[PDB]
Amino acid sequence: MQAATVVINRRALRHNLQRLRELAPASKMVAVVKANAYGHGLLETARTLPDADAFGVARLEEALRLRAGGITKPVLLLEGFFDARDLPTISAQHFHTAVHNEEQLAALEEASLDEPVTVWMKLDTGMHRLGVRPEQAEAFYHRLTQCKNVRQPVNIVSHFARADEPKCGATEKQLAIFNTFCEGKPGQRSIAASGGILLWPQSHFDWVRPGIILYGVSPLADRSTGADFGCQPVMSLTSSLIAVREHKAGEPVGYGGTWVSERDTRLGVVAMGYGDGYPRAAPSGTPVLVNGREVPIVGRVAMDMICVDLGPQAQDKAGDPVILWGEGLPVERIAEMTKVSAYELITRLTSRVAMKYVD
Amino acid sequence: QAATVVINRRALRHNLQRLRELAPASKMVAVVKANAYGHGLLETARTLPDADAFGVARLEEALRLRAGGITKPVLLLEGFFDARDLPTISAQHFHTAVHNEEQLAALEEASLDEPVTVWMKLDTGMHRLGVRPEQAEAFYHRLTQCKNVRQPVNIVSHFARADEPKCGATEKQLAIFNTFCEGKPGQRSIAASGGILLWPQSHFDWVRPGIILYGVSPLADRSTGADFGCQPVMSLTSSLIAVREHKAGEPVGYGGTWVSERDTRLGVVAMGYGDGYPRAAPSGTPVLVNGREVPIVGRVAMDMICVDLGPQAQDKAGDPVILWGEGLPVERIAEMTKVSAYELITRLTSRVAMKYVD
Numbered sequence: 001m002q003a004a005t006v007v008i009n010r011r012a013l014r015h016n017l018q019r020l021r022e023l024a025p026a027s028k029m030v031a032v033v034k035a036n037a038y039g040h041g042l043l044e045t046a047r048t049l050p051d052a053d054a055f056g057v058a059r060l061e062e063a064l065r066l067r068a069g070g071i072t073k074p075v076l077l078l079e080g081f082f083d084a085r086d087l088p089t090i091s092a093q094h095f096h097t098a099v100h101n102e103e104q105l106a107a108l109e110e111a112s113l114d115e116p117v118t119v120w121m122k123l124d125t126g127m128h129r130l131g132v133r134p135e136q137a138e139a140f141y142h143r144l145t146q147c148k149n150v151r152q153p154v155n156i157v158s159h160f161a162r163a164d165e166p167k168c169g170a171t172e173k174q175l176a177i178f179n180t181f182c183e184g185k186p187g188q189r190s191i192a193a194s195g196g197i198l199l200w201p202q203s204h205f206d207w208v209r210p211g212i213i214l215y216g217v218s219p220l221a222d223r224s225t226g227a228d229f230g231c232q233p234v235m236s237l238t239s240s241l242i243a244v245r246e247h248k249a250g251e252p253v254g255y256g257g258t259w260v261s262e263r264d265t266r267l268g269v270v271a272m273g274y275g276d277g278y279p280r281a282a283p284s285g286t287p288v289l290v291n292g293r294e295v296p297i298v299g300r301v302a303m304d305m306i307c308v309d310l311g312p313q314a315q316d317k318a319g320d321p322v323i324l325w326g327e328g329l330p331v332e333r334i335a336e337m338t339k340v341s342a343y344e345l346i347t348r349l350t351s352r353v354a355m356k357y358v359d
Numbered sequence: 360q361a362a363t364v365v366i367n368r369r370a371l372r373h374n375l376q377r378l379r380e381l382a383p384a385s386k387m388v389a390v391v392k393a394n395a396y397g398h399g400l401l402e403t404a405r406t407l408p409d410a411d412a413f414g415v416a417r418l419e420e421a422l423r424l425r426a427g428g429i430t431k432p433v434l435l436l437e438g439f440f441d442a443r444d445l446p447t448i449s450a451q452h453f454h455t456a457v458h459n460e461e462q463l464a465a466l467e468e469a470s471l472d473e474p475v476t477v478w479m480k481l482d483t484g485m486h487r488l489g490v491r492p493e494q495a496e497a498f499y500h501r502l503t504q505c506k507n508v509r510q511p512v513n514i515v516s517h518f519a520r521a522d523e524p525k526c527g528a529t530e531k532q533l534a535i536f537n538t539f540c541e542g543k544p545g546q547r548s549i550a551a552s553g554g555i556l557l558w559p560q561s562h563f564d565w566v567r568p569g570i571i572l573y574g575v576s577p578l579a580d581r582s583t584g585a586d587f588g589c590q591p592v593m594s595l596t597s598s599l600i601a602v603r604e605h606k607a608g609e610p611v612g613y614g615g616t617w618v619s620e621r622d623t624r625l626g627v628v629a630m631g632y633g634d635g636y637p638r639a640a641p642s643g644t645p646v647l648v649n650g651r652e653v654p655i656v657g658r659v660a661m662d663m664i665c666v667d668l669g670p671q672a673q674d675k676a677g678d679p680v681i682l683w684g685e686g687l688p689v690e691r692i693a694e695m696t697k698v699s700a701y702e703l704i705t706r707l708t709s710r711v712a713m714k715y716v717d
């Protein structure tokens with residue numbers, strides 16, 4: 001049998017890259033594949049995409065696994081290097097690197113590398129997470145232009161904190177700061193990720209960094225899916241029923257007796273739980289497809305099972321196909337229901353689920 | 360240097376035996392399903408050669424144990440999902456639960472080189488898996504007539520509200536489990552972590568410690584493992600990748616969600632929900648930077664968490680961070696975030712590096 005499994009549609013990956021090239025026609029693409037490619041598989045997502053102009057990661061650990069798998073494209077270390085000793089590996093492997101502190105800068109100033117590196121000076125434009133603050137960037141930037149160990153020109157990168165909230169002037173204030181600093185300077189400019197791409201065409205610049213939207217899921221703080229932008233659900237979280245049992249009115253199902261039935265019915269048990277990555281927070285009523293027909297979750301979601309209400313004479317039975325989200329059921333619909341972010345839903349999965357790749 | 364789960368092997372064996380002291384007349388089924396609750400399926404098994412069996416959710420998982428060289432009986436807590444799977448289960452000497460018609464009919468007509476040991480799963484109130492009572496003495500009788508089943512047929516069940524001693528769920532559930540097992544040979548087992556600690560009349564022949572085995576309390580009452588003499592096994596650790604200046608009135612994070620009322624210094628941790636850390640963590644949650652507790656400030660993110668260090672603080676990129684672990688029980692983090700400790704330690708991704716000490 002099949003319990004739990006993530007089916008990855010390679011043909012949809014393929015298409016949202018293109019579809020994103022159509023939305024940001026004058027910008028190069030940095031396919032963001034950090035965190036095991038948002039739960040879709042780091043190496044397999046990269047291999048699905050010989051077209052990305054580059055690949056973005058969080059950590060080096062992650063870039064090095066690309067290389068190990070045979071991926072040859074430029075890989076962008078979005079957060080940089082964490083230790084000055086990895087700078088020889090960086091230049092060897094031809095990684096590009098963000099530089100946000102004076103430890104990473106100082107480390108490039110002094111290191112003796114065989115080849116210079118390509119760098120992006122992270123500028124803090126309003127997120128206040130990583131990056132050099134404005135009042136500090138002009139001097140930091142100038143030191144990078146004088147490194148013989150950095151490739152000229154120095155590129156400039158930044159990130160939006162609230163691009164999915166078009167009504168607050170957040171984004172437009174970051175853009176103002178970004179534009180002021182990049183005035184008169186060569187080399188290139190990122191600042192846009194999924195939101196900036198979809199919603200702010202004035203912050204496409206030279207390179208855009210699609211992450212969540214790449215996978216056909218939406219960045220947005222509302223009920224838009226990837227299909228709202230012509231982008232196609234990459235992932236399908238699937239499993240199977242391992243039991244179909246009789247149940248009676250007034251009887252609770254499961255831990256804490258969270259749900260009590262008002263009628264005699266039949267309950268289905270799914271080989272899926274939080275030990276696989278399915279949200280334990282999922283409330284009774286959350287939709288799940290059993291044989292393609294929606295049924296509600298009844299009870300607490302356990303570590304490796306989920307109960308659903310099939311009906312008093314349903315004909316489903318152990319072994320039948322279950323879809324937690326995918327074709328027929330977006331992850332955005334499971335996010336609105338659960339109250340969990342689609343970003344977390346597709347990404348915080350464990351190693352217990354099998355990975356399948358299709359097309 | 361970064362996201363890492365440190366597993367204390369010493370605390371793990373302290374707990375198994377702590378638990379044999381609490382349930383002195385019962386044999387131990389070390390529950391290691393879901394990658395041993397975060398901790399590592401096979402390495403948790405190899406740390407406990409002593410325990411009397413291992414429990415898993417799926418057959419996949421049992422097979423992975425045999426592949427690593429583990430040889431204690433393994434108990435398939437949910438049984439087998441396909442009949443073509445009886446032959447493997449028989450040869451590999453996996454013990455199984457039997458809760459439905461399909462599984463029983465499979466046992467009835469398989470041909471097998473050896474008989475398989477079985478635990479009939481009885482639904483005593485949880486209404487999740489198991490044969491209902493009106494229906495169980497037949498189910499039962501058919502299993503004792505299998506020559507494919509090693510006699511006697513054992514009986515297993517599970518509590519749905521053992522952590523709520525004030526409601527009569529458990530004692531309703533035990534009443535049923537006891538009426539059915541009247542007069543029948545073969546082992547009995549119904550207790551997991553909660554039943555073991557709060558209900559000694561429920562220990563019977565075998566108890567199945569799961570969460571407590573890892574030194575974490577199963578009650579959402581604010582107690583720890585230590586509260587039962589059990590030592591925490593897991594420490595979710597990482598490092599700071601930046602220490603930056605920040606000013607009063609400035610926000611931080613997705614949705615500028617925390618705004619500072621002072622000039623301070625923020626630390627950035629190489630930890631996010633892409634690692635398994637709850638995105639739901641509110642500003643406030645405790646982190647330990649440099650063995651000193653600091654609050655999370657801002658939304659948590661795929662790969663970085665910001666903390667408030669202080670205007671003048673001398674923490675430095677590179678420095679050690681503990682999400683939970685020694686200075687910081689996972690139960691404290693569960694109270695501050697409203698997640699279950701069960702989910703916190705288990706729903707981690709594959710990006711966590713695993714360390715084993717002692």
Ligand SMILES: *Cc1c(COP(=O)(O)O)cnc(C)c1O
Pocket residue numbers: 032034078159192193194195209210211212213219661
């Ligand atoms: C992860 C990340 C991205 C992608 O963002 P999405 O909203 O998922 O598209 C782009 N850039 C940086 C700096 C990131 O850390």
Ligand SMILES: *Cc1c(COP(=O)(O)O)cnc(C)c1O
Pocket residue numbers: 390392436516517550551552553567568569570571577
């Ligand atoms: C997983 C499980 C356990 C162990 O539960 P804890 O609450 O962690 O003690 C024991 N028995 C069964 C039937 C289970 O599914």
